[PDB]
Design a protein around this nucleic acid. Structure first.
Lengths: 117, 144, 51
RNA sequence: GCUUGAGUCUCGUAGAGGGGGGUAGAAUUCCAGGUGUAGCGGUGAAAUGCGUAGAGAUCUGGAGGAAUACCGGUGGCGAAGGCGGCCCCCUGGACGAAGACUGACGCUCAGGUGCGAAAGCGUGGGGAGCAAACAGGAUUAGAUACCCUGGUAGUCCACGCCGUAAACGAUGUCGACUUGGAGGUUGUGCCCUUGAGGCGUGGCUUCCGGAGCUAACGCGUUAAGUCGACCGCCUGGGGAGUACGGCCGCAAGGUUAAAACUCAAAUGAAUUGACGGGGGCCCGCACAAGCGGUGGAGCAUGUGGUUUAAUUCGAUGCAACGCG
């Protein structure tokens, strides 16, 4: 179906969850998979293992497109992200670019207070 | 074990088959320092195991014990960790013997002969203990 | 940031991420505007950097 | 009168000094649209919350507000509060080089006047994020908290008020003298520059230390050393920086400022120890790895209690309870 043959893997690692979205070069999503949607709810959805099985599961569900090349775009910090791109070249993809696209303000908005734990 | 790294003591092999593996199996089975009784039970049970399966003695034992050896075992985290080989077959024998004590047959040689026979086609209780351990270490795979 | 595919490679192993953004810069902008704790955190950081 | 104090002029230097105006780029939120699909978010774990009315992720376009990553530095500037993108306009101070000029014009300062973070107040705007109050979810014995999800005043602008802070180098201002070392920053002169040069002379500043001082801790040419001038303030702890009165303030409150009564201490620095849900290193059947027990049953024996005429006395966390 529609046979795009090149895409972008936007991986959005945060501290609590990694969410991998495989799209095309136009930016239209072709299929996604989160670490929290792969079993292991909770303290286990923020691990490199959960991110890699999230990326394995996002490599599935884009078989209908015949993607061979993809760029990787990485957001946020997280226990994910590093393992995530590994799972992508464990799934036959030719990984072309690895950009880190974490949003950094140039002293913009005030961050929240928190955490007197 | 706080300080002292240790050696280990050498057990005498089995007086019928020369197997230190099976010698540790009669030590796992032994209660109250009665070794003669336990080796009688092991010779009877493995003798009917060799007669039933028709293979041989300690390769029927080695198959029936090969089906129950654990692969890996498990804030409070239950991490999976790879079992050492001596601990591997030590756990194998402890689960066979414990499950054989759980059974409801007549004699201990029949309970353990039927438990090793149920472990030869891996359908007994010790294999459910191994699958249980492997479900715990398989569910919690996310910690390494 | 960006690293182009090499002609004969298995792992890109980009270190672009490490030299700048991940470790410090995003973990710093998770928490409060002070003016006060940074003046003392930098004061004791430059007072610790001593022989 | 005089120039060694103070000041003026010439030429430059560095600077987040101030006020006004403009602009730029990242990011957050919102709105509209494309793809796409079952979760997202959150936590120690959860739930509230958002989501098949299509969220989150992702791309495009727009709006708006605030703050200005990197440079960034015990770096700089300012009397202090404080001041951080870039550009323009108006403007204050400092420092340096040589020379000229005035000629003690100086120092401090009670009352007085001005400036004075943040929160707060008034009027009018603005309102993206954050967030007192507030609401819900948790946690808990309770939880009017810490944690989570939302969230209003406020934070932002204009003008006025307030007038305070651990407004702190807890160190008033001005001047003079008194061994050193390593830096930072900003001027400048000289000398093969023949480096990542050399040698000097100023301004501000950081760390360590000598004499000296100090209760000690420490300060140590930027003094808490050695002196001089003027000011401010102190006189045991509490009551109390409170009440009354005055002045100020829209208010909140600010400032000035007692007494009765009560205690024989309150305090500073340092020492020894003990302790810590502080840190480092180390041990023991301490935990872990195992095996067998106890707690359940009947009996033995000891104890507490009860009973009794008496149920002899003693032992009572560990280290009393088949103990004397």
């Amino acid at each position: 179906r529609k046979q795009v043959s090149d895409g972008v893997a936007h991986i959005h690692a945060s501290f609590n969850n990694t969410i991998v979205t495989i799209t095309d070069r136009q930016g239209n999503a072709l299929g996604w998979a989160t670490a929290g949607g792969s079993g292991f709810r909770g303290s286990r959805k923020s691990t490199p293992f959960a991110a890699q099985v999230a990326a394995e599961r996002c490599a599935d569900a884009v078989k209908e497109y015949g993607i061979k090349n993809l760029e990787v775009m990485v957001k946020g910090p997280g226990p994910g992200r590093e393992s995530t791109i590994r799972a992508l070249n464990a799934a036959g993809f030719r990984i072309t670019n690895i950009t880190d696209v974490t949003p950094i303000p140039h002293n913009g908005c005030r961050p929240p207070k928190k955490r007197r734990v | 074990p706080r300080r002292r790294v240790i050696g280990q003591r050498k057990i005498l092999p089995d007086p019928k088959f020369g197997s230190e593996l099976l010698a540790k199996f009669v030590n796992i089975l032994m209660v109250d320092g009665k070794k003669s009784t336990a080796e009688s039970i092991v010779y009877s049970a493995l003798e009917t195991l060799a007669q039933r399966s028709g293979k041989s003695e300690l390769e029927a034992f080695e198959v029936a014990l090969e089906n129950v050896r654990p692969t890996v075992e498990v804030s409070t985290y239950q991490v999976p960790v790879e079992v050492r080989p001596v601990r591997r077959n030590a756990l194998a024998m402890r689960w066979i013997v414990e499950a054989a004590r759980k059974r409801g047959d007549k004699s201990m040689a029949l309970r353990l002969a039927n438990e090793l026979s149920d472990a030869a086609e891996n359908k007994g209780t010790a294999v459910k203990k191994r699958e249980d351990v492997h479900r715990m270490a398989e569910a919690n795979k996310a910690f390494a | 940031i960006k690293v182009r595919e090499n002609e004969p490679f298995d792992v890109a192993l980009r270190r672009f991420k490490r030299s700048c953004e991940k470790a410090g810069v995003l973990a710093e902008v998770r928490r409060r505007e002070f003016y006060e704790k940074p003046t003392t955190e930098r004061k004791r950081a430059k007072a610790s950097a001593v022989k």
